[PDB]
Symmetry: D2
Subunit: 334 residues, 4 copies
């Protein structure tokens, strides 16, 4: 009864989503589209990974199809999304991960090819946004084009939801120390709009602006206009962290915050929000599937109404697993 | 009329202080003490630097003395500070930079050797603390043992002073993204008290606790009990940054904050607090002598009473130059 | 019938040897000695690893013993090796991994405590050296104190043995690009004898001298006086590589070399010497248990008598697994 | 009497060539062409540099011209090289640094715009190659399109020339440990032909093939067919090194090699080939203008006919300075 999924784009997010789908088994990948990557290169790129290690399984090419663990996958090389024959391959859901089709009008071209629903693995200007464990109960089958927001938003939303439900956030500012991404450059090089983003990634911290904190207001309507922040890009492979400073409506000692966060991570947000009291560092969360992990020992509170909270997140694996979970929930809602 | 200065310890801070003194010419180094470094090794370590490049000048050993730019320097190899003959070498002021003699009782052993005053280049539990441009006018000749605080405190204090004087800080929390230091380790290794500090510096962000924000209260009495924060250690050579989130008593748009900071950096805090509107990154502040540089474009404000401000600082060169400036002011006060 | 093993020192090599022993099951660890690491710190250090990830299993402290996968381990904190009661704990073989007891006289102190045989996990000036798959058949029960050489030697020896047996090496020079180790320093710092080794590991290549190529002559007597080389230390976590340039006695096209290396890696040196024709990079060999992997595509030959060969090796996991294998062979020889 | 020079492309090589020309004063830049970089971005990119620091001077835009140290520079934005009006701007020599016009036919389009001679700052398949201090005396005014080879070739050629002239190289194999370049990628990403080059630059060593050693045969005809090698790309900012293993015709102890290299570096190859006996590392050669620096202490010799030599080179500054020197010599030859 597992839904059939097609993936548009074999970049980092697409490859990691395919890996998560094959590791968990919640969905079945049946088609992939990439106009610039051939079959043998696809096999090479899927087999080896610098950050997450060698794939645990078998991958090979046979009769022009990518075979992963014995399951053949159809390969397309179309540049126009409306010309991809998703229906012929049997793909019911399509994951749009290229990062250039984010509006509803642009992302709706996949429906012309026979797909039933489209999931955008990035922030969208007009498509509805859903975060697993926060507002995923709001989804309905009436929706064909939705969005899974972003990694930073997926890390910030559950902790913010717990804190707001228990103590009433009045206003907060967020800072995230983020690992390097594919949009950056090894050495000083041209960068059209963001001049800072063109500087050498290995030698600098390159501050940056982000909209995840604002998008939390879209995910949680009561927090609209009460959050915002920025980011710093450090020369680290993948693991990233979130730092939230907020003012609370009700008094809250740090012990009470720890207790409520642990209780939330146990029952309701199990597998989404983690909790740890150990002396962890960034590399301890490599290949971790949690959306966010609360670091009890790293935070600090000035008084009962002004605190700073720290949460870790693997911006590669966690987001891909969340995408797979959202697709599984959508299939169950059918 | 320049004062004669002796340096205890030839570590990073001691070498950088010697470099700053010879580059600026405000003071004259006449003696150095290090029990574990010989003369030729001293020449090698002073001549070459991975972060700040080759020394611009001449350094060599002659008749058992270190000769820098033609000035001979006496070399000691004593382990007990009370046995160093500072007075015989002619040293009037002594810079204690080993990091293990920080209390007044421990640091006062240098006075037995003939030194007149002692400056501790690190936070002290009981010695008075001074920050140039903030409270250095409070110093008096009655003081023999004082402290120059720390780099992070030197970065945070001037900006906090300007903001408090103009808008009345009510409470703030600080986060600093800090470059790696000598106390860290290349690969996972033992670390007695701070378990996180023993993890590999090249692979992790290793969160950490700090007291610079609290020490700002000591430097600025009106801010006592209103500041605190923590730090993240990233795999960068030297340049570091400060991120301050605070609530203001009076309304303040971001333009007004920019105007007041620029005005302060022009007249009163010239050479101590910088100001820039360019798209800078961390490497742009290598070998910069400012205590802190305000990054106008990187900050963000939620509303008129809740803002986040960003300031850069070279934690190696700026602190050394501040130490030299403090010694020059002390000599002028004689 | 598995032999009981005690480990002296809980550094990188000791921890990795314990991990390899518990992962493979060839031997049983029953005792560990470290005077500077307590029990809880031992649990923390064994549980988490920046390079090889979290330990797959359970580790905890109970009644003053380290319990790994349900097996209790006695803990000692002696500084004098002759005072360690190895016999009381039941340890028959002892692994000396501290790096400071490498001579036969120094390493023989463990025999006074009740140990039967001692294995030095480092090069020794006078103890016999053995490399698995090269000369491990030379060992006899008459030996109580032996040596497993070093990682670089373990990588170079099998390939050199195959090449010499098939084509007759006349003379060769080796260069190894090595990852950073615990003896290096994060920032420019003092280093007694090796001045280059004290420079910042994150910013430089720091050339270095090594004796592994010469030690290959000890392991393979026919190659005595025909090999030597040096090393470069690059800012990488662990994976390292070997580059061997040699002149051959008999003509040998590159295809013949590839064929003989593949044949050797299949039958006789299975699990010790690997072979690959893929476009691999350094991270593809993380946690690989091979002593050396021949990179067919990376090498180059000037003519039929002058070639350059490339081999990869994980200098952490491979050496530890080789130590465990040597101990297992010694136990079987009893 | 200084020649007027135009630069095609404002990438790394073009910007560094402009910097070298303005620092040395041997030539005068009067025009620059880049279709994708505007004037203000050009000012920003020239002013700030992560590797070599802030430009020592003044740069600004005025009346649509780039003004450096008071000298206005014409700016073009043409994509077709034949449409650039080099003659109108007064450019007599043109530096082709885009890396895509390397053949004589492609590079000759600049002559249609009014340029007199074209210098290709990269290896060329059919244009004559010149290396300063090796064969630059072979140039004649009859040549309009020539080549300056490459950085690695410029490092290897002078040392090889000295060694061949003094001892008669019979055959040699070269390995270079190279810093990261703009063609690499921060995270695992697509790379059309070179699959290894698409892997993450910050996490791997990524072996690679090169033709500099073969090109040395073109520069030095007597060494044709006697040299070749490969490269390793390490995660370092810029400084790179060369490692040459060769067999000598005549006996040569290491002391004799050191003596001849020092003598060559003093008189004939002054400013091109350096010599050092200190314990240097890679960062000690940042912004060094030498083509190659011989590291006496790092090399090793197996016997009197088989040696390994080490030479350092800044692959950014040295090559740019060599390009400027070649243009100055060409102008003098007029």
């Amino acid at each position: 009864g597992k839904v059939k999924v097609g993936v548009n784009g074999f970049g980092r997010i697409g490859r990691l989503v395919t890996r998560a789908a094959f590791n968990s088994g919640k969905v079945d990948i049946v088609a992939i589209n990439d106009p610039f990557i051939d079959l043998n290169y696809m096999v090479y790129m899927f087999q080896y990974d610098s950050t997450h290690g060698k794939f645990h399984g078998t991958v090979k090419a046979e009769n022009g199809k990518l075979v992963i663990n014995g399951n053949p996958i159809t390969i397309f090389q179309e540049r126009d999304p409306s010309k991809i024959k998703w229906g012929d391959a049997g793909a019911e859901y399509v994951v749009e991960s290229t990062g250039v089709f984010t509006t509803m009008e642009k992302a709706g071209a996949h429906l012309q090819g026979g797909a039933k629903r489209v999931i955008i693995s990035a922030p969208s200007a007009d498509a509805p946004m859903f975060v697993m464990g926060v507002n995923h109960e709001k989804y309905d089958n009436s929706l064909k084009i939705i969005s899974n927001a972003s990694c930073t938003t997926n890390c910030l939303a559950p902790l913010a939801k717990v804190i707001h439900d228990n103590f009433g956030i009045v206003e907060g500012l967020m800072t995230t120390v983020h690992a390097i991404t594919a949009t950056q450059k090894t050495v000083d090089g041209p960068s059209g709009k963001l001049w800072r983003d063109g500087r050498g990634a290995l030698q600098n911290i390159i501050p940056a602006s982000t909209g995840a904190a604002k998008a939390v207001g879209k995910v949680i309507p009561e927090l609209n206009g009460k959050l915002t922040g920025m980011a710093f890009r450090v020369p680290t492979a993948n693991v990233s962290v979130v730092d939230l400073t907020c003012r609370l409506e009700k008094p809250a000692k740090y012990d009470d915050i720890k207790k409520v966060v642990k209780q939330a991570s146990e029952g309701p947000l199990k597998g989404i929000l983690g909790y740890t009291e150990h002396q962890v560092v960034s590399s301890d969360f490599n290949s971790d599937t949690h959306s966010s992990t609360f670091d009890a020992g790293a935070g600090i509170a000035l008084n009962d109404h002004f605190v700073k909270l720290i949460s870790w997140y693997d911006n590669e694996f966690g987001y891909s697993n969340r995408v797979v979970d959202l697709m599984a929930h959508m299939a169950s809602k059918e």
